[PDB]
Amino acid sequence: SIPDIKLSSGHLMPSIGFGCWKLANATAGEQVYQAIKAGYRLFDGAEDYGNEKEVGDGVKRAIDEGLVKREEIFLTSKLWNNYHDPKNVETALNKTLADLKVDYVDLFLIAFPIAFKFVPIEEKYPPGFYCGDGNNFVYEDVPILETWKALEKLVAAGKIKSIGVSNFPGALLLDLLRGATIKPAVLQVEHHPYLQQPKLIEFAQKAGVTITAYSSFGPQSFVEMNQGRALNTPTLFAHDTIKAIAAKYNKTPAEVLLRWAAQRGIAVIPKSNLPERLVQNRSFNTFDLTKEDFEEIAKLDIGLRFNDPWDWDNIPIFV
Amino acid sequence: SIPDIKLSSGHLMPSIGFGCWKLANATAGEQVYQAIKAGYRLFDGAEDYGNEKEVGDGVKRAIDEGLVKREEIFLTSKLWNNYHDPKNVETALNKTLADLKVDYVDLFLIAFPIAFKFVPIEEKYPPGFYCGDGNNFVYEDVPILETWKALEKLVAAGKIKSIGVSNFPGALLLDLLRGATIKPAVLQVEHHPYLQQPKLIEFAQKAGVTITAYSSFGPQSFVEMNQGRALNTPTLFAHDTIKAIAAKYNKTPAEVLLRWAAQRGIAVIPKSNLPERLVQNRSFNTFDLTKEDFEEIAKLDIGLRFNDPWDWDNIPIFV
Ligand SMILES: NC(=O)c1ccc[n+]([C@@H]2O[C@H](COP(=O)([O-])OP(=O)(O)OC[C@H]3O[C@@H](n4cnc5c(N)ncnc54)[C@H](OP(=O)(O)O)[C@@H]3O)[C@@H](O)[C@H]2O)c1
Ligand SMILES: NC(=O)c1ccc[n+]([C@@H]2O[C@H](COP(=O)([O-])OP(=O)(O)OC[C@H]3O[C@@H](n4cnc5c(N)ncnc54)[C@H](OP(=O)(O)O)[C@@H]3O)[C@@H](O)[C@H]2O)c1
């Protein structure tokens, strides 16, 4: 029932998956297990989410019970910023594989086009913004392409099925395409009605790169982090445009928010700590938005970005 | 006074220069020569402007008459898109040197982070959007860094004093800084009240990169090009904010738009076919805008870009 998208690498990736960012290590495993029971098969994780061991626990529990087999689960992980130096790429991946308790990850992405100074895993993991010098941000001169080649080798060694990038703007994706032997199969970016970036989406899809949207619910995911911007932002759930469209089809605002992406060939990975939202967040493909619907939602695009490295240390990724 | 800016390469660059874009071939020489008599010393040219030979004619005349010596003139040129393949970089630079009738250029920039398929000089020069196949755009897989390394070798060989980039967004500049041995000394970008990109400017300047603004008058330069966008844009000269400030100081709106950039350490290269505009464009450093002025002008930033490759062939440089 969840349509699959055939990636450029030839592998199928579920168009709807379960987001694992901010799932408490306390209930993460149980919730991953429940999501599997609710039909989810793709799990979007990351070294920086700090809960890959638990994600691995949920998946393994489901495999041991005979509910699914490894090959039916799609595991996405992301290489954190401290591990871009080629000599450290496989190290990070091994940690991810060890934590997930598997021999390969289906998709491995470069989390950000940012290279923090390397911090040994034994000194601090996940490292977050720590760069080995107190609270100071420190960077390494590792061009994107160097990191990418190291990933290409790891695909050849069979530790990764498909590789891609996250948080890459157009100019950077274009340059990477010029040097890539294995084309980035996926581009994962913040994507919701307040940040539509239609030209980026268009370019990538035409280039055969599949888009996975994150934070489809806009500011929602960020208010629990006490982020001023998200808190000052009117929710999409109570937004008149979204509510009117939802009423029109007798659907929930959440369903409209997810279908808006899904209908345009964009994969989604809604995250939820609430059991009842599990089925709801993957059963929204029951109606079609009209061109007029899309034009009305288009008016919400204001370029409001919630996940911006500029906030961390004025890193110019999106300027 | 025309203050000099010390570039990261150790060389001085006049903070005020003369743009050569769309300077007609029949009069370019005279125009450059008059510019020199009026005190200009930096000339912003480019292979794609197709008038480098005539710009060279003007400079040579001024030198032959004794008005200036070569070392007193700062010549900037740009590597067009069809010449990014490392093996074509020196041949393009050599065509520029032969046209300008000089042994070295003071600044040579990558015109765009775009790589068009090589087209022999003998076949078409300047090539413009022609890519060797009718009206079809055809690109080469040449990563920015490869082109950059070719430029570094030309500096070592003494054919270029300082190198830089044009039309590079933040993420791309950042990545280039990771692989560069000679750091790009300059970032030349479209810069005016409608497209302020304050974060790009701040990052570049903090990174020690000098900013050269182009199209300081916004839509104006693109008007004679019959560009839809520019034609439908309320001018900056007539914008109430700019008018009020110009009136307040008894300066033309043009003087305010140039000083607005200059006071913030940004170099300008105003282009003008008229004599009085020529002198005014080099004599506006006689007043300082106040913090309130800057705050009022800051309000115009709507991110309106007139020079966007997206319009050529949906090239994602700025998305
Ligand atoms: N590559 C990157 O940089 C990056 C960054 C951010 C996110 N991501 C990935 O994308 C995933 C999804 O994005 P996200 O987690 O940031 O935010 P999201 O999925 O848009 O956030 C969902 C937020 O809304 C609530 N919610 C979930 N389903 C709902 C529903 N049906 N109705 C009303 N509210 C609902 C959740 O609360 P409850 O949990 O209480 O239900 C949660 O606070 C992440 O988990 C992660 O895997 C990647
Ligand atoms: N790197 C790049 O991609 C790029 C792209 C564009 C430009 N550039 C460089 O930047 C230079 C300047 O940019 P630009 O020529 O596009 O835009 P600009 O300098 O803003 O163009 C000035 C336009 O405004 C008029 N003008 C000049 N001085 C004036 C004054 N004092 N009062 C009122 N109007 C005035 C000119 O008309 P008249 O000639 O009739 O006086 C001309 O049409 C170029 O020549 C080129 O060297 C680089």
From Swiss-Prot, chains A, B:
Record note on what altering K271R does: Increases affinity for NAD. Strongly reduced enzyme activity with NADP
EC number(s) stated in the UniProt entry for this protein: 1.1.1.307
CDD domains: AKR_AKR2B1-10 (cd19113)
Outcome of swapping R277H: Increases affinity for NAD
Keyword vocabulary terms for this entry: Carbohydrate metabolism, NAD, NADP, Oxidoreductase, Xylose metabolism
InterPro entries in UniProt: AKR (IPR020471), AKR2B1 (IPR044486), Aldo/ket_reductase_CS (IPR018170), NADP_OxRdtase_dom (IPR023210), NADP_OxRdtase_dom_sf (IPR036812)
Subunit structure: Homodimer.
Task of the protein: Reduces D-xylose into xylitol. Has a preference for NADPH, but can also utilize NADH as cosubstrate.
Protein's recorded name: NAD(P)H-dependent D-xylose reductase
